[PDB]
């Protein structure tokens, strides 16, 4: 496939001015007798994603002339002058030549307040550190001479979820390798051990004033994970199946596994045979990292059900459909 | 066993109210401080109001950006907790989430208000504030929102009144929070072309009743990485023949309300650890002394609620003990692997 590129990745700017977003992409977007399939929507937040501007330039119908688009070739531009209040939200360029016909990355438009815009708890929003690597996070303000404060992870569209609070208090289930720290007028979390899914915001909580009833939220930091490769060599699996073992058949469950040992690509398509059929919810699957011994990844295919169901039929299968291997390398079981 | 769930939220007008609900169990809500938080979208938290406890007096406190506006109240009998949000502005939109306060008070130095902290926080409601009417082009409405189990199937409608719109190519979108829009697969108008994308042509379904103008979308084998909003979209484009007829994609024109979905994730031969009740467990192998190719899997939450997960290395064809150790729940499970028929 080829992608966009949407950039800048946000802005914030004041109302009555004026913005400007650009959409790059691979290779090109116009055909013949000079066209330009390329469209941009806003979604306004909650509301379905509005139409804007499509095919290059051409303003759809309703939409304020403050709104025009630009560009040619594979990089685009639209303007938006005397910007008001509900022009908020993502904004996305949209290609119509090249299928399959993909988006790009979006653009959340904030309106500056320039009104008590003056956070309590000051905290840098750009970190970024590589892949099983240490890094820490700080947090400023005039109540940490006489506060601590407590520190969350927020992952878009959840829940936050809070990580350290106080001198050092670690709640359960949260993994051990964050811990929090302090000194003076500033307070820090560090992760000492890098991982994928710590990449999210993060934000620090704390007294605004020094003896005061409030609480205020920081800035926000986006923490970033910077992982590499090792060797990106197509590789195939090694395909093994294990059937349910007797002790097992002396209970009421029976579970089916199927293996994929050391290979690249990460993809690989699975699909079971509970009996030359799909299934329909009763698989599930687990992988591990790359072993730092061979770079490669792993497989590990459950297929459970209930022992008066696995009785049932004589030939399951394991289909592997890889990119280094070709052919589906079936595996198959019997009782005997 | 905290649980904590927004509601209440929709959208109103500038300037006219709105009530928030927090339904919270699994704790003693009476003597428990609670506190309401926000975050305008794309931005940062900001704290908004708390209320105390029992013996505290019930006095609340606002923020400032919030004072005299907003009111926080509490039920201690329906273990619910509000949020009265009067006069608002353009400026509260964003997502309103209410969370388990905490009174953190370092014992034996001793100091005069402490710090407050958040233990339990909900998924969070939405506020929106814009005046519009949303109702004017209403001419593509699609199905309720709805919830299933990881596993099931799930169909998405989407229609338009009676035989309204076709000219115009059906066009499915889904939208990720945070992730950003994402094309998913169409339906020329002529029929000759259902294009799905090969990242989602293994699980989804698209499907053109033209009897009665009404677009499926079949959602097989859920997974929690789909839980997001379905849009619908009908638009122009632009055929030109070559050898094999060819198509451009001009517009999404006119949308749909969006079917928001969520799946609830919370409403060479090896050994297996099978039904164990707290995460994690460890596996070495041969006594900690094999480690060439071991490929210890991580854990998953089946159906039962307990994880499982598996734990295998890969062994040379000449040679033809993994101690399992769960320590929270005081289980030795030491086991040697041997075929038999």
């Known amino acids: 496939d080829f992608v966009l590129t949407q950039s800048p990745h946000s802005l914030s700017v004041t109302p009555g001015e004026s913005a400007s977003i650009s959409c790059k992409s691979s290779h090109s977007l116009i055909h013949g007798d000079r066209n330009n399939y390329l469209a941009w929507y806003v979604q306004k937040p909650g509301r379905s994603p509005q139409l804007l501007i499509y095919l290059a330039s051409s303003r759809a119908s309703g939409v304020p002339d403050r709104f025009s688009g630009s560009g040619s070739d594979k990089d685009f531009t639209l303007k938006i002058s005397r910007v008001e209040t509900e022009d908020v939200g993502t904004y996305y360029c949209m290609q119509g030549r090249e299928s399959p016909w993909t988006f790009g990355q979006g653009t959340k438009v904030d309106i500056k307040d320039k009104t008590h815009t003056a956070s309590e708890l000051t905290q840098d929003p750009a970190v970024s550190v590589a892949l099983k690597q240490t890094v820490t996070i700080t947090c400023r303000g005039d109540?940490?001479?006489?506060?601590?404060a407590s520190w969350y992870q927020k992952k878009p569209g959840q829940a936050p979820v809070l990580l350290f609070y106080?001198?050092?208090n670690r709640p359960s289930g949260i993994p051990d390798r964050f811990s929090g720290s302090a000194s003076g007028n500033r307070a820090s979390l560090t992760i000492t051990g890098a991982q994928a899914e710590d990449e999210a915001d993060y934000y620090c909580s704390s007294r605004d004033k020094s003896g005061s009833r409030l609480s205020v939220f920081g800035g926000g930091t986006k923490l970033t994970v910077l992982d590499k490769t090792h060797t990106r060599t197509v590789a195939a699996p090694s395909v093994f199946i294990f059937p349910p073992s007797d002790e097992q058949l002396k209970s009421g469950t029976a579970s089916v596994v199927c293996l994929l040992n050391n290979f690249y690509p990460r993809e690989a398509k699975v699909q079971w045979k509970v009996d030359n059929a799909l299934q329909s919810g009763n698989s599930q699957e687990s992988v591990t990292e790359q072993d730092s011994k061979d770079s490669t990844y792993s497989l590990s295919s459950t297929l459970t059900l209930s022992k008066a169901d696995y009785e049932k039929h004589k030939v399951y299968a394991c289909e592997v459909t890889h990119q280094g291997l070709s052919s589906p390398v079936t595996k198959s079981f019997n009782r005997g | 066993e905290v649980r904590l769930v927004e509601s209440g939220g929709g959208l109103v007008k500038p300037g006219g109210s709105l009530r928030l609900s927090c339904s919270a169990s699994?704790?003693?809500?009476?003597?428990?401080?609670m506190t309401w938080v926000r975050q305008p979208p794309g931005k940062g938290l900001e704290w908004v109001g708390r209320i105390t406890g029992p013996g505290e007096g019930w006095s609340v406190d606002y923020a400032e950006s919030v004072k005299g506006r907003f009111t926080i109240s509490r039920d201690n009998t329906k273990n619910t907790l509000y949020l009265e949000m009067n006069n608002v502005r353009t400026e509260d939109t964003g997502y309103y989430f209410c969370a388990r306060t905490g009174k953190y008070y370092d014992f034996w130095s001793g100091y005069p208000p402490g710090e407050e902290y958040f233990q339990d926080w909900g998924q969070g409601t939405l506020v929106i504030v814009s005046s519009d009417k949303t109702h004017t082009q209403v001419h593509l409405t699609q199905s309720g929102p709805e919830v299933r189990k990881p596993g099931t199937s799930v169909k998405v409608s989407c229609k338009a009144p009676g035989n309204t719109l076709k000219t115009y190519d059906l066009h499915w979108v889904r939208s990720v929070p945070g992730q950003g829009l994402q094309w998913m697969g169409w339906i020329s108008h002529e029929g000759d072309k259902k294009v799905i994308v090969e990242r989602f042509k293994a699980k989804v379904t698209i499907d053109w009743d033209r009897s009665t103008n009404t677009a499926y979308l079949q959602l097989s084998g859920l997974t929690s990485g789909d839980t997001a909003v379905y849009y619908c979209a009908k638009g122009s484009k632009h055929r030109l023949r070559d050898y094999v007829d060819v198509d451009y994609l001009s517009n999404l024109e006119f949308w749909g309300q969006g079917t928001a979905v969520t799946v609830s994730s919370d409403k060479a031969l090896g050994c297996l650890v099978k039904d164990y009740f707290p995460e994690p467990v460890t596996v070495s192998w041969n006594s900690g002394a094999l480690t060439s190719g071991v490929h210890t899997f991580p854990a998953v939450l089946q159906s039962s609620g307990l994880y499982s997960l598996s734990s295998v290395v890969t062994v040379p064809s000449s040679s033809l003990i993994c101690n399992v150790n769960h320590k929270p729940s005081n289980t030795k499970v030491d086991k040697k692997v041997e075929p038999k028929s």
């Open positions: 106080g001198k050092n």
């Open positions: 109540s940490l001479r006489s506060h601590y």
């Open positions: 699994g704790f003693d809500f009476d003597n428990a401080w």
